[PDB]
Design an enzyme around this catalytic site. Structure first.
Site, PDB file in Angstrom:
ATOM      1  N   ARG A  83      -0.105   4.676   2.774  1.00  8.46           N
ATOM      2  CA  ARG A  83       0.016   4.491   4.216  1.00  8.46           C
ATOM      3  C   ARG A  83       0.280   5.792   4.999  1.00  8.46           C
ATOM      4  O   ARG A  83       0.084   5.827   6.189  1.00  8.46           O
ATOM      5  CB  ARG A  83       1.034   3.395   4.526  1.00  8.46           C
ATOM      6  CG  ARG A  83       0.492   1.980   4.328  1.00  8.46           C
ATOM      7  CD  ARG A  83       1.550   0.901   4.578  1.00  8.46           C
ATOM      8  NE  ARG A  83       2.503   0.795   3.483  1.00  8.46           N
ATOM      9  CZ  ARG A  83       3.595   0.074   3.538  1.00  8.46           C
ATOM     10  NH1 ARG A  83       3.865  -0.571   4.659  1.00  8.46           N
ATOM     11  NH2 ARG A  83       4.401  -0.009   2.478  1.00  8.46           N
TER      12      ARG A  83
ATOM     13  N   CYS B  81       0.784  -1.246   0.000  1.00 10.72           N
ATOM     14  CA  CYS B  81       0.000   0.000   0.000  1.00 10.72           C
ATOM     15  C   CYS B  81       0.805   1.280   0.000  1.00 10.72           C
ATOM     16  O   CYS B  81       1.556   1.611   0.953  1.00 10.72           O
ATOM     17  CB  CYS B  81      -0.998   0.002   1.152  1.00 10.72           C
ATOM     18  SG  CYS B  81      -2.035   1.450   1.240  1.00 10.72           S
TER      19      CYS B  81
ATOM     20  N   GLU C  56      -5.155   3.779 -10.809  1.00 18.81           N
ATOM     21  CA  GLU C  56      -5.892   2.558 -10.514  1.00 18.81           C
ATOM     22  C   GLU C  56      -7.099   2.421 -11.450  1.00 18.81           C
ATOM     23  O   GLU C  56      -7.404   1.322 -11.879  1.00 18.81           O
ATOM     24  CB  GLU C  56      -6.349   2.470  -9.059  1.00 18.81           C
ATOM     25  CG  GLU C  56      -5.221   2.418  -8.008  1.00 18.81           C
ATOM     26  CD  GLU C  56      -5.808   2.556  -6.629  1.00 18.81           C
ATOM     27  OE1 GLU C  56      -6.199   1.537  -6.045  1.00 18.81           O
ATOM     28  OE2 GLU C  56      -5.986   3.687  -6.162  1.00 18.81           O
TER      29      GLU C  56
ATOM     30  N   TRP D 158      -9.470   6.460  -0.836  1.00 18.42           N
ATOM     31  CA  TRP D 158      -9.774   7.193  -2.052  1.00 18.42           C
ATOM     32  C   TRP D 158      -8.784   6.724  -3.150  1.00 18.42           C
ATOM     33  O   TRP D 158      -7.734   6.149  -2.834  1.00 18.42           O
ATOM     34  CB  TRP D 158      -9.698   8.715  -1.838  1.00 18.42           C
ATOM     35  CG  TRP D 158      -8.439   9.181  -1.229  1.00 18.42           C
ATOM     36  CD1 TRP D 158      -7.238   9.386  -1.859  1.00 18.42           C
ATOM     37  CD2 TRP D 158      -8.248   9.545   0.144  1.00 18.42           C
ATOM     38  NE1 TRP D 158      -6.310   9.837  -0.949  1.00 18.42           N
ATOM     39  CE2 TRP D 158      -6.910   9.955   0.283  1.00 18.42           C
ATOM     40  CE3 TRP D 158      -9.089   9.576   1.270  1.00 18.42           C
ATOM     41  CZ2 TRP D 158      -6.383  10.399   1.514  1.00 18.42           C
ATOM     42  CZ3 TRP D 158      -8.558  10.012   2.504  1.00 18.42           C
ATOM     43  CH2 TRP D 158      -7.223  10.426   2.596  1.00 18.42           C
TER      44      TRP D 158
HETATM   45  C1  HEM Z   1      -6.089   6.590   1.403  1.00 22.41           C
HETATM   46  C2  HEM Z   1      -6.261   6.113   0.180  1.00 22.41           C
HETATM   47  C3  HEM Z   1      -5.500   4.941  -0.305  1.00 22.41           C
HETATM   48  C4  HEM Z   1      -4.779   4.833  -1.476  1.00 22.41           C
HETATM   49  C5  HEM Z   1      -4.537   5.892  -2.556  1.00 22.41           C
HETATM   50  C6  HEM Z   1      -4.261   3.517  -1.489  1.00 22.41           C
HETATM   51  C7  HEM Z   1      -3.480   3.069  -2.556  1.00 22.41           C
HETATM   52  C8  HEM Z   1      -3.247   1.740  -2.718  1.00 22.41           C
HETATM   53  C9  HEM Z   1      -2.882   1.160  -3.953  1.00 22.41           C
HETATM   54  C10 HEM Z   1      -2.664   1.866  -5.292  1.00 22.41           C
HETATM   55  C11 HEM Z   1      -2.671  -0.151  -3.704  1.00 22.41           C
HETATM   56  C12 HEM Z   1      -2.205  -1.147  -4.738  1.00 22.41           C
HETATM   57  C13 HEM Z   1      -3.238  -2.243  -4.993  1.00 22.41           C
HETATM   58  C14 HEM Z   1      -3.627  -2.226  -6.427  1.00 22.41           C
HETATM   59  O1  HEM Z   1      -3.054  -1.472  -7.250  1.00 22.41           O
HETATM   60  O2  HEM Z   1      -4.540  -3.010  -6.743  1.00 22.41           O
HETATM   61  C15 HEM Z   1      -2.973  -0.396  -2.349  1.00 22.41           C
HETATM   62  C16 HEM Z   1      -2.844  -1.625  -1.760  1.00 22.41           C
HETATM   63  C17 HEM Z   1      -3.383  -1.811  -0.478  1.00 22.41           C
HETATM   64  N1  HEM Z   1      -3.872  -0.907   0.417  1.00 22.41           N
HETATM   65 FE1  HEM Z   1      -4.171   0.916   0.060  1.00 22.41          FE
HETATM   66  N2  HEM Z   1      -4.591   2.857  -0.359  1.00 22.41           N
HETATM   67  C18 HEM Z   1      -5.401   3.623   0.389  1.00 22.41           C
HETATM   68  C19 HEM Z   1      -6.034   3.333   1.617  1.00 22.41           C
HETATM   69  C20 HEM Z   1      -6.002   2.091   2.232  1.00 22.41           C
HETATM   70  C21 HEM Z   1      -6.744   1.710   3.347  1.00 22.41           C
HETATM   71  C22 HEM Z   1      -7.729   2.553   4.132  1.00 22.41           C
HETATM   72  C23 HEM Z   1      -6.412   0.406   3.631  1.00 22.41           C
HETATM   73  C24 HEM Z   1      -6.966  -0.396   4.750  1.00 22.41           C
HETATM   74  C25 HEM Z   1      -6.971   0.107   6.011  1.00 22.41           C
HETATM   75  C26 HEM Z   1      -5.491  -0.038   2.654  1.00 22.41           C
HETATM   76  C27 HEM Z   1      -4.919  -1.293   2.611  1.00 22.41           C
HETATM   77  C28 HEM Z   1      -4.294  -1.688   1.430  1.00 22.41           C
HETATM   78  C29 HEM Z   1      -3.913  -3.104   1.242  1.00 22.41           C
HETATM   79  C30 HEM Z   1      -4.149  -4.279   2.194  1.00 22.41           C
HETATM   80  C31 HEM Z   1      -3.308  -3.163   0.067  1.00 22.41           C
HETATM   81  C32 HEM Z   1      -2.661  -4.345  -0.673  1.00 22.41           C
HETATM   82  C33 HEM Z   1      -3.413  -5.611  -1.138  1.00 22.41           C
HETATM   83  C34 HEM Z   1      -2.404  -6.758  -1.304  1.00 22.41           C
HETATM   84  O3  HEM Z   1      -1.586  -7.143  -0.386  1.00 22.41           O
HETATM   85  O4  HEM Z   1      -2.378  -7.341  -2.407  1.00 22.41           O
HETATM   86  N3  HEM Z   1      -5.228   1.028   1.828  1.00 22.41           N
HETATM   87  N4  HEM Z   1      -3.242   0.805  -1.689  1.00 22.41           N
HETATM   88  C1  LIG Z   2      -8.546   1.011   0.443  1.00 27.47           C
HETATM   89  C2  LIG Z   2      -7.956   1.196  -0.933  1.00 27.47           C
HETATM   90  C3  LIG Z   2      -7.764   2.456  -1.522  1.00 27.47           C
HETATM   91  C4  LIG Z   2      -7.205   2.509  -2.815  1.00 27.47           C
HETATM   92  N1  LIG Z   2      -6.966   3.661  -3.469  1.00 27.47           N
HETATM   93  N2  LIG Z   2      -6.904   1.380  -3.494  1.00 27.47           N
HETATM   94  C5  LIG Z   2      -7.046   0.159  -2.929  1.00 27.47           C
HETATM   95  C6  LIG Z   2      -6.613  -1.055  -3.733  1.00 27.47           C
HETATM   96  O1  LIG Z   2      -6.065  -2.099  -2.929  1.00 27.47           O
HETATM   97  C7  LIG Z   2      -6.425  -3.418  -3.063  1.00 27.47           C
HETATM   98  C8  LIG Z   2      -6.396  -4.272  -1.942  1.00 27.47           C
HETATM   99  C9  LIG Z   2      -6.783  -5.618  -2.100  1.00 27.47           C
HETATM  100  C10 LIG Z   2      -7.188  -6.108  -3.347  1.00 27.47           C
HETATM  101  C11 LIG Z   2      -7.207  -5.244  -4.440  1.00 27.47           C
HETATM  102  C12 LIG Z   2      -7.628  -5.743  -5.805  1.00 27.47           C
HETATM  103  N3  LIG Z   2      -6.423  -5.930  -6.606  1.00 27.47           N
HETATM  104  C13 LIG Z   2      -5.374  -6.836  -6.168  1.00 27.47           C
HETATM  105  C14 LIG Z   2      -5.882  -8.175  -5.617  1.00 27.47           C
HETATM  106  C15 LIG Z   2      -5.686  -9.246  -6.655  1.00 27.47           C
HETATM  107  C16 LIG Z   2      -5.131 -10.473  -6.292  1.00 27.47           C
HETATM  108  C17 LIG Z   2      -4.958 -11.457  -7.263  1.00 27.47           C
HETATM  109  C18 LIG Z   2      -5.338 -11.197  -8.588  1.00 27.47           C
HETATM  110  C19 LIG Z   2      -5.894  -9.959  -8.951  1.00 27.47           C
HETATM  111  F1  LIG Z   2      -6.264  -9.692 -10.225  1.00 27.47           F
HETATM  112  C20 LIG Z   2      -6.069  -8.989  -7.974  1.00 27.47           C
HETATM  113  C21 LIG Z   2      -6.814  -3.910  -4.308  1.00 27.47           C
HETATM  114  C22 LIG Z   2      -7.570   0.053  -1.631  1.00 27.47           C
END
Ligand code: HEM
Ligand SMILES: Cc1cc(N)nc(COc2cccc(CNCCc3cccc(F)c3)c2)c1
Ligand code: HEM
Ligand SMILES: Cc1cc(N)nc(COc2cccc(CNCCc3cccc(F)c3)c2)c1
Ligand SMILES: C[C@H](O)[C@H](O)[C@H]1CNc2nc(N)[nH]c(=O)c2N1
Ligand SMILES: C[C@H](O)[C@H](O)[C@H]1CNc2nc(N)[nH]c(=O)c2N1
Ligand SMILES: [Zn+2]
Lengths: 407, 411
Positions: free
Chosen positions: B111, B108, B285, B280
């Site tokens: 953070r 993430c 994305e 947000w």
């Molecule tokens: C504040 C706005 C936030 C933004 C811009 C953000 C941005 C991102 C992005 C771009 C990813 C990459 C995942 C992807 O591209 O599919 C991600 C992963 C993640 N974020 Fe955030 N995030 C935000 C808030 C949060 C919140 C509130 C949580 C939970 C409390 C969170 C937990 C995660 C987790 C668990 C992942 C990774 C999933 C994995 O391990 O595959 N994020 N974040």
């Molecule tokens: C809370 C939040 C805010 C923000 N701007 N963006 C996110 C995106 O984060 C996550 C967290 C968990 C899962 C996903 C979906 N994409 C990855 C998961 C995944 C696993 C395996 C295969 C896939 F195609 C996709 C996205 C989460």
């Protein structure tokens, strides 16, 4: 122990077995992944030698033949006697091709078997190195129709007699720190440029001065040579749409030629083994031109395009970046100097990855370096799971020689 | 042990000691790096150490480590585990645990925001209808008419693993994908399987390109039930481009609220199998992945056509050109409607400050470079040149299998 990789765009799954033949270590453990880190006697030699010859004789379908055993014996006899050994030409060609095949950071390995290998193991002096190198440059450049090649100087002995090419690439531009406060030319090269000045080079102090070669033979002090200008092919950079672009004064060289790496074959270490191919566009446009630490020209280009540089969210950087990269590809194609774009390069590596899975049982790949530095997820390598591991023969990093050289 | 990470652009070097508190494993060895692999009942036995370790972390954070309150709480949890075989977190521990899962989420990039997280405690929830209501409140609170606020809602923890709370949707808000007899897809191809489940369960699918999926909610191990999010609760943005007036006629839109609903929240050995969280969007994305992946909306050709780029050879960089234009449009639209969004330049710069700060005050910041680096313009964002150590800390967010693969149907 038999590992699968999934491509998340095509769903194609491959099974990796080759990784079991992995010998060197990664930097990673079960507790910490080090995937994004840039740089993590008679005894050991025969096993290394045998490991190599075994794969060699296996590749020519003579595993366990008399020729095989004879050579194994022969090499063994030579190590016990001479404390080292010599590779046959065939083995050297094969070794070098395979160090390329095994380079997990190289997107261009579809080409690995077309490497012209120049055996310079008979070279004794730095003047000789200069001659071999000029011949390499000239052969590889082939008037812009680029061919892959490697020149292999003599192997390391007691390690007090190393051949080294001190340049990091055969062809690179100088860098000068100024009283001005800023850097003229290529900032990546300041230190080595100072070593050239302090060895005697008369710098033209331009933005794009071709470095002289610093050649070290047989562990002697290194000497300066200039590559004949007529052998250094260069491309002036213009844009196919922005008339003003050519007024930025940008040029790059056509021949990418890494000269500071170490080639290990069957335990033997070739500390000077400059090697070359041809550029993927982003190497020049994205990294050479746009990296903060490099020519850093994004601000200047965005300005000429009249983009809203007020807020990052206009994506003015991204826009300027693409245009710079269009210009690179355009300039090279216009002059008929071989170049590949990242779309085409990465599509090629996916085909190659597939050939290597079905023909060899896998393909070590380092995702961090394979995925291009722009437009990552629209190239297929982005969606491709890769396994990273170290096979031998291999290319390896070695300490910059100035840090090591007994003067 | 001390580990160093270099930034190759700034020469800033950082030192990590936090990786020493890591327990879970990476899937890497000394012989093989699996850094680009996508996905690499408890017993009293394991449970108490996990509880103790979590509560020591908790009690340190509030500067009460070794206090009587500390010791009594360990005592109290010890007992509860021995007699009831699990235990209940206090509100404050729950809040701390959920913040920390976020903080420890190494993939993430957002953070910097970890400490500002509204925690909704839904551990008194008992039915699917109860879940619906909690989720509607979450979505309405998080959306906040476009001024998005981070939030998580936490339903009761796993017990025997036969009574799980699950949100079957992968995000709370997502568009239906429909497979057509001709083999083409209408709407979002990522969500085809789940759309079929919804239809199989009784959803009347409008069959458009942008239909908001209904929630499928499982409470207490029972079969999932269907509910529609009130449309007035679903904020969407029509996508237009600032210079290209034809952009709007592509008919693109997107929802404002990204809300992950299929992860597991592990706190002190406890498993919260339903814990939807929302933030947000970072522009890329939607604009790189959702729109331009070949397996998603796949609108690159169409955009480059309208821009009339040379589409004959890939070396004109027509794909790259169009990708940028789409991404400008996404940011432009969200800004014009006052729906919170961050661009990838701003997001990655904030993360680097966050990451440095975490190194100073915490001793490290686990980060996964494959994921932190944005999917466009990688090398002109400061994360590209940042070395990063990846490791797993708890509390944590984890993947879990899709519930349709595992649910024991009652009927
Ligand atoms: C504040 C706005 C936030 C933004 C811009 C953000 C941005 C991102 C992005 C771009 C990813 C990459 C995942 C992807 O591209 O599919 C991600 C992963 C993640 N974020 Fe955030 N995030 C935000 C808030 C949060 C919140 C509130 C949580 C939970 C409390 C969170 C937990 C995660 C987790 C668990 C992942 C990774 C999933 C994995 O391990 O595959 N994020 N974040
Ligand atoms: C809370 C939040 C805010 C923000 N701007 N963006 C996110 C995106 O984060 C996550 C967290 C968990 C899962 C996903 C979906 N994409 C990855 C998961 C995944 C696993 C395996 C295969 C896939 F195609 C996709 C996205 C989460
Ligand atoms: C033929 C055209 C070639 C292309 C397009 C190409 C492409 C690349 C690219 C893009 C990289 C990324 C590293 C960076 O960004 O600086 C790379 C790394 C590398 N390539 Fe190539 N390559 C080519 C030929 C060769 C040849 C002929 C060899 C050697 C025989 C070679 C060996 C390497 C090695 C060793 C690395 C990585 C060094 C390391 O481990 O850090 N490549 N290649
Ligand atoms: C032969 C060839 C062709 C082609 N198109 N591109 C290449 C690029 O390959 C290499 C190989 C080795 C080194 C480099 C330079 N890149 C970063 C190396 C590096 C490592 C550690 C510290 C540094 F400052 C720099 C680039 C090589
Ligand atoms: C920190 C990170 O490992 C470093 O920036 C890498 C990332 N990927 C790269 N990829 C290529 N092809 N070349 C590079 O120099 C780098 N640098
Ligand atoms: C195969 C590879 O790990 C996979 O494509 C990853 C790469 N990096 C990613 N990065 C982010 N932020 N999101 C993703 O879905 C992915 N996908
Ligand atoms: Zn690893």
């Amino acid at each position: 122990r038999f590992l699968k990789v999934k491509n998340w765009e095509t769903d194609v799954v491959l099974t990796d077995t080759l990784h079991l033949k992995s010998t060197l270590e990664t930097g990673c453990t079960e507790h910490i992944c080090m995937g994004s880190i840039m740089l993590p006697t008679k005894d050991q030699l025969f096993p290394l030698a045998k490991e190599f010859l075994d794969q060699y004789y296996s590749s020519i379908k003579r595993f366990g033949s008399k020729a095989h055993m004879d050579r194994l014996e022969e090499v063994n006899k030579e190590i016990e006697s001479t404390s080292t050994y010599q590779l046959k030409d065939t083995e050297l060609i094969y070794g070098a091709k395979h160090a390329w095949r095994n380079a997990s950071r190289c997107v261009g390995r579809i080409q690995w078997s077309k490497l012209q290998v120049f055996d310079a193991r008979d070279c004794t002096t730095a003047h000789g190195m200069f001659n071999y190198i000029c011949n390499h440059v000239k052969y590889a450049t082939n008037k812009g129709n680029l061919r892959s090649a490697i020149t292999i100087f003599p192997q390391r002995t007691d390690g007090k007699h190393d051949f080294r090419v001190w340049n990091s690439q055969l062809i690179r531009y100088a860098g000068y720190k100024q009283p001005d406060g800023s850097t003229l030319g290529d900032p990546a090269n300041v230190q080595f440029t100072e070593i050239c000045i302090q060895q005697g080079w008369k710098a033209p102090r331009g933005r794009f001065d071709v470095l002289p070669l610093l050649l070290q033979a047989n562990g002697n002090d290194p000497e300066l040579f200039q590559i004949p200008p007529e052998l250094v092919l260069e491309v002036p950079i213009r844009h196919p749409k922005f008339d003003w672009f050519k007024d930025l004064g940008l040029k790059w060289y056509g021949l990418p030629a890494v000269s500071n790496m170490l080639l290990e074959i069957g335990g033997l270490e070739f500390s000077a083994c400059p090697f070359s191919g041809w550029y993927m566009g982003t190497e020049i446009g994205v990294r050479d031109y746009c990296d903060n630490s490099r020519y850093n020209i994004l601000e200047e280009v965005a300005k000429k395009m009249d983009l809203d540089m007020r807020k990052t969210s206009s994506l003015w950087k991204d826009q300027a970046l693409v245009e710079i990269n269009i210009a690179v590809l355009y300039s090279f194609q216009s002059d008929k100097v071989t170049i590949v774009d990242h779309h085409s390069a990465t599509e090629s590596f996916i085909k190659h990855m597939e050939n290597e899975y079905r023909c060899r049982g896998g393909c070590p790949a380092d995702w961090v370096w394979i995925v291009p530095p722009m437009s990552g997820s629209i190239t297929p390598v982005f969606h491709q799971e890769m396994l990273n591991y170290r096979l031998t023969p291999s290319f390896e990093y070695q300490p910059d020689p100035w840090n090591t050289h007994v003067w």
